[PDB]
């Protein structure tokens, strides 16, 4: 293994390697991440341990860091003009002089021909121990030159979504070693939606396998990185190196998700028919009690439902719950006179049921009482009343 | 108050209680136990005392105990279904892997407080031990029915990973913090809370607008001075029922309206677009790219980008993009794919089935960076038209922001 002294003594042997990043739009190389390499003893080894070592003085990190960047940016001057240049930069070291010296190094290469808006700067926020509002201040300055900001390692140690969103980054880098909790896609889904509202694109990294790439794609992944794509190498690659492979790999993701979306919408339709038949059959009868009715319905729909109740237009529960437990139905009258408009989507679905004049399923959510994952089916009725049915699973 | 003052007069220490209110029944669901001492003809908080890092842990637990015993003695006599919210530091609890505390709880089960009424307010970002061990221990607690609530969610603790791991029963979000970054981050936590099954409890509600924010963003439970301040005794369970019933009626009414105003707006826009498109599409043998140019001029007042895609998200045309009040044509976006975008495929099969067009929620455009909405409109030949709306049009319409 490599002692730090070994590196500073042979500083002329240090070189950048590059890892390509691929777009979901054009399935093409959109830019590269600059990584640090040294030629020691007929072999190439990473300067990672060297940059990550807290024991090594900062100037020697910057000393080396510099030659790699110069070599890397010298290379970019000659490649395609629209390539992005992703660069790892510690917040604290960058903040030693409020980023002054670094920016001048970037400014230098603008003159030499690299537009500043090609620079993506990989910052790790939870590593920062200075005043966060000051770091956020500085990056503002950077952006006013078009410089892009990417935040690393989301959700690991001191990571913080409040502090991240304040930074209002251009990119979020999410690594998927995490995928090797079954419920991690909830994490991913949540992230993308936060990212969509503040306008940060998602870059998934450390993609070592296919299922990982699929996870990336179907959870809002705009850009992609990993060994499974292309490993870091000393030179650049043909921009459309993986185009056909990704085109086909993505076609298959699309097909899957559609077969997936249609299959659930189709299922919803038939269920609406089953419910419509059941309800109108029962509703032509002398069951004035709104409560008598849902009991009958539950027996009708015994195979697929586990809870049923009715509410009015403003979310007030008109009836009490029928609840299936241990294969038997129980009547819980106490649940009458409760309001549910506070629930996400609830009011939205009321006006949807009206306008659309049909019934439908919700997405998957975790029922507050039982705890297991369920879906609710909402069905509109005569007299501006709305029926709710709770369904567990059927995969 | 010096800490010595407290330990010296430990017999003067007493719990106060703050009630917590349900959105369902607008009633008192339980109380948070808070720590107080009677010093010099007056009542003052032991907060500073529990938060002081200088004070040895034994003396914090010594006092803590006096309060919990008094508090739980009180609960033995109140209603049987009341929840008991209790502040507990992770690190002090982890000094003996929670063994002693649990035995204290176990004791009161015998005396008549079934364990599922206990909510344990933990602050995860204060923990400096191995997280997976703390997560390990709380599992044990839960297997007795003990409930777990995490504190300072939203700001100080905002780790979708940890939240997803500790898999808590409750998230406590405080609203002194009160769209900004902050409101979008609660959004993403909200979305998760419903997926992992954690109820939202909003606290530090000092005003009405705060309560409304709480309500419309998935708040199941509520706390603050604006509701009821802490006091040394319990309150009648339906103390605020009618006040909250009416205060919530007004939130419901409001939301039924902000939502209609946007759906109404969508309908008319669909008509405008339908008229424009079919006018331009009838007697035209010019290409799809030529068409969208004409359309952008048609819709010049309200659009800023227009393009078409096929059923699998491949962009059929270039873009027309309005810039500095002029329309530019961007051939480069031809043959780009967008199915990776959230909602994209979902909306294709929605446009088909429903056979109509509609707006998206508000999102931040990746190029311009301002907040926009997109309108999706289905066409003949299994093709789909998209139109990105600027803020300048959203801002001066009714309730699209
Ligand atoms: Ca990196
Ligand atoms: Ca608390």
UniProtKB/Swiss-Prot annotation, chain A:
Family matches, as InterPro entries: Cyclic-di-GMP_PDE-like, EAL_dom, EAL_sf, Sensor-like_sf, YkuI_C
What molecular function terms (GO) are annotated for this protein? cyclic-guanylate-specific phosphodiesterase activity
So which residues are the signal peptide here? none
What cellular component GO annotations does this protein have?
plasma membrane
State the Gene3D superfamilies in the record: 1.20.5.170, EAL domain, PAS domain
Database matches in SUPFAM superfamilies: EAL domain-like (SSF141868), Sensory domain-like (SSF103190)
Q: Which SMART domains match?
A: EAL
Q: Where is the EAL domain?
A: 1-246
Pfam family example for this protein? EAL
Q: What is this protein called?
A: Uncharacterized EAL-domain containing protein YkuI
- State the organism of origin: Bacillus subtilis (strain 168)
Lineage runs: Bacteria, Bacillati, Bacillota, Bacilli, Bacillales
Swiss-Prot record, chain B:
Please tell me one Gene Ontology term that the record gives under cellular component.
plasma membrane
Q: Where is the EAL domain?
A: 1-244
Q: Which domain of life is it from?
A: Bacteria
Q: Which CDD domains match?
A: EAL
Signal peptide positions on this chain: none
Gene3D superfamilies reported for this sequence:
1.20.5.170, EAL domain, PAS domain
Q: Which SUPFAM superfamilies match?
A: EAL domain-like, Sensory domain-like
Gene Ontology MF terms = cyclic-guanylate-specific phosphodiesterase activity
Pfam families attached here?
Answer: EAL, YkuI_C
Give the protein name, as stated in the record: Uncharacterized EAL-domain containing protein YkuI
Q: What species was this sequence derived from?
A: Bacillus subtilis (strain 168)
Q: What is the lineage of its organism?
A: Bacteria, Bacillati, Bacillota, Bacilli, Bacillales
